[PDB]
Design a binder for these strands. Structure first.
Lengths: 74, 66, 100, 51
RNA sequence: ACCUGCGAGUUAUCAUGUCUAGCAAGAUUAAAGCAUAGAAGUGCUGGAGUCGAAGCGAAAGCGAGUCUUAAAAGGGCGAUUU
RNA sequence: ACUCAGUUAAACUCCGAAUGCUAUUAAAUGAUGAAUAGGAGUGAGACUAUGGGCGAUAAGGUUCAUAGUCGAGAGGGAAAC
RNA sequence: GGGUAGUUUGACUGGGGCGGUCGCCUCCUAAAGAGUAACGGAGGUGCGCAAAGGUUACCUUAGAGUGGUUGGAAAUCACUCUGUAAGUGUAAAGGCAUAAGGUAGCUUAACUGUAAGACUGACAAGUCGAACAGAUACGAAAGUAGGUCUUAGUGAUCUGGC
């Protein structure tokens, strides 16, 4: 009577790639995620798989509004 | 001349040398079933690439003359 | 006698065989060190009195950042927030005297 | 029940595109306005065989 | 078993790196010949060939540019600073 | 089903640390960083102090995470170890 | 055609064998970056869709209570409370009120040549990507559109065919 299961996928390495306050240049990846765990603010864009990336050079910042987190470049 | 080091022909037919060290090669996965692969993927697979610097020493051993 | 129990017992006896006089000396040293650290902007002389062998990696890195590599190491430092934090991390392995 | 079809430029006959289509669902003759790179212009492409 | 002898990274060529010696945008001869000697030498003769001096592109071909392309429009591989 | 009071949950979370991780600045510590070129060896770990899973909150058991030690470390102590 | 000859018939495995398993995706184990084992504990998968795609415009369930021919606890409709628990082709998770939910019109960007700058990573690979040129689709226009809300639906090289 062997084990009926034991099966796991490859870890996808999600999470925040640039920390709030760090300096990024155009096109950087900031967050990798499934779904808008973090939403888009000023000067960032959202990829087809909800990746957060920087449209211009600046400093990352996270804000909170009504309990939702927004990423921006300032 | 009794013992000239033989080149590895199957490697010669796939590797190329640039002037200052790098190795040029043709990317894989653009030889076969292609309908499902996205257009931008195929376009990137068409253009040739350079190998990582970690294989260059072994390749230089494989191609003693080229 | 069962090996599990005798190993536990031997370890417990070694641990419990510490001398209260030595503990009191250590307590006195700790009190002195905390009193000195509580000051602000003085030149303090730091002696290293406990070895680096076997200690935590983080603490070895802190001590090498203070400049002490051996027991008997002497270094004078100016107490600001950075040095105060390092001294607090490694308070149990140092002896602080004050440079009048 | 899904076959690989090829979309053919009407006015050149080049097999510009390939796609998937489900047989036994329409059995029609799918037409698609696709861009024909030979002409630098969009045009009509019709379903056709691959091999 | 003890003791004493014997008992294992060598040679020949190619690739590549470093050191030493020499020349230098050039460097170098291989086979082989002649002369003297009898002294399996070493002084000449011998430049056929190889490696640099331009690379890029599958190739044609073009060239400090070349290819991918209508595009030096952006890049890939180069370089003007060997 | 509803109200009051009191409880369980690694695959429940209306809330949420302490540490750790990341960025900047000022001190502090002096070849510990990085790149290129040449040359390896290793790809059997073990134990202890913690956080775990499996086992039977059994095993000097098996398999992960942090740190140390042995490994490759003499000396002193834990009777030998 | 075992008359005879040359060979193959795997590995992981709490010894081996038997049994079971081998790709990929979702969650926990996993100790609040990432990563992190097991024959640890639970599921799905080798597709479907010419719309279930793109664009524009317009809209919101489920449940509780109440009143109505079939109609009952429950089918359809009205209202109150509730405010996403409903629903997102397909497993689960993360997300989705500006709805990514639903309806309708038009339509094929389910494009070509490309790409600054990155994540993940031994390598080979994989993924995001502003913006540029040509040709469009939709909208008055700004803009969006390089398939499917995202995360599985897949296979190198060699050889051969069109």
């Amino acid at each position: 009577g062997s084990s009926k299961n034991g099966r796991d996928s490859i870890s996808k390495r999600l999470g925040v790639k640039r920390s709030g306050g760090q300096f990024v240049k155009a096109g950087e990846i900031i967050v990798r995620q499934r779904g808008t765990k973090f939403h888009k603010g000023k000067n960032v864009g959202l990829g087809r798989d909800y990746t957060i990336f920087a449209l211009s050079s600046g400093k990352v910042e996270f804000k909170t509004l009504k309990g939702r987190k927004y990423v921006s470049i300032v | 001349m009794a013992n000239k080091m033989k080149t590895r022909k199957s490697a010669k037919k796939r590797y190329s040398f640039t002037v200052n060290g790098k190795v040029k090669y043709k990317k894989q996965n653009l030889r076969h079933i292609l309908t499902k692969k996205s257009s931008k993927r195929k376009r990137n697979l068409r253009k040739s690439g350079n190998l990582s610097c970690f294989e260059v020493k072994r390749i230089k051993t494989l191609l003693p003359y080229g | 006698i069962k090996r599990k129990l005798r190993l536990q017992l031997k370890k417990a006896r070694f641990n419990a065989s510490r001398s209260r006089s030595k503990n009191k000396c250590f307590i006195k040293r700790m009190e002195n060190n905390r009193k000195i650290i509580s000051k602000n902007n003085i030149n303090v002389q730091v002696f290293l009195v406990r070895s680096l062998i076997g200690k935590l990696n983080k603490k070895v890195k802190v001590l090498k950042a203070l400049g002490l590599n051996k027991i008997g190491d002497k270094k004078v430092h100016f107490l600001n927030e950075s040095i105060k934090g390092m001294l607090n991390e490694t308070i149990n392995m140092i002896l602080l005297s004050e440079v009048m | 029940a899904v076959e690989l079809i090829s979309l053919i430029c009407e006015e050149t006959g080049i097999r510009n595109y390939t796609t998937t289509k489900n047989r036994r669902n329409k059995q029609e003759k799918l037409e698609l306005m696709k861009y024909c790179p030979k002409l630098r212009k969009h045009t009509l492409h019709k379903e056709g065989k691959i091999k």
